[PDB]
């Protein structure tokens, strides 16, 4: 119910030709396991100057029980949101 709101917000900013999401800012990847919501927020917390992810960031805050404010591979945010989007659609079995 509320997750599909998050999903379709991801889908909306993942749209074909718009400029790449948040210039070429890049964040730390995360394992799409458990605690993915809090992890996605903490990796997207330090993105600077990008209003296209603001609704996304506020929405994810409703999915993590605490206030936020593994580093193997750093990925473009456009690819980070694409990765998380496929994981969330899967949990919406």
């Amino acid at each position: 119910t509320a997750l599909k709101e998050l999903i379709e917000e991801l889908v909306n900013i993942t749209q074909n030709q718009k400029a790449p999401l948040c210039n070429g800012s890049m964040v730390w990847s995360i394992n799409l396991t458990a605690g993915v919501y809090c992890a996605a927020l903490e990796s997207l917390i330090n993105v600077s100057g990008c209003s296209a992810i603001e609704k996304t960031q506020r929405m994810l805050n409703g999915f993590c029980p605490h206030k936020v404010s593994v580093r193997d591979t750093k990925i473009e945010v456009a690819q980070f949101v694409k990765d998380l989007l496929v994981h969330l659609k899967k949990l919406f079995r």
Partner: antibody
Amino acid sequence: VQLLESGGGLVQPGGSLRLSCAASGFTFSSYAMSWVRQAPGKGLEWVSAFSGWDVSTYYADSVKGRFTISRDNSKNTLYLQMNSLRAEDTAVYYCVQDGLGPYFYNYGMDVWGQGTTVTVSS
Amino acid sequence: SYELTQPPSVSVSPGQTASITCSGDKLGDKYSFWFQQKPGQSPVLVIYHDSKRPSGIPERFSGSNSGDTATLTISGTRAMDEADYYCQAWDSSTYVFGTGTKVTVLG
């Protein structure tokens, strides 16, 4: 996005009222919803909340056991059944678009309705 | 935390900076929210998640939350900014409001 409160009026102590709040302009069933009241000339006091993720409900200690928050997603309407009303319950009652997700409180409140007036006097 | 304390009154002249405080035990560990209520109308969200401005809110509004104090700053306060401002946070399964600050712009 609009929150249209209704059902206020004058009532004696011990009486009952049922407030309603017609919601529009947003997917109502996905967001938690809250009631916040303001006694004349005083500050804001949160009353109750109904989660948009659970059926869990939350209340301020001044109204627990007396107030019941409810919702109907098909009509996009929020309700507040107020029983055993007291004089200190006199206030303007606002219906507030609350948070998305299970931890809706970390999302926060957003839009507020214009409110209806409830006056409890013997 | 459970008791958010705000100074009752804040007064500035137009163009000056108005700083509104809101103190609470370990308030810096929670998300802080600020609500603006102009006389005769319902409150409007002006700051969420300590520092974010919602859509359509004037850019002179800014917020910070650190330690045990949340601060709302109005840079170059204008006449239309006269309002009651309210602090807010979540604690023990309840929403807790600050006692409120009346911001008077000496016009």
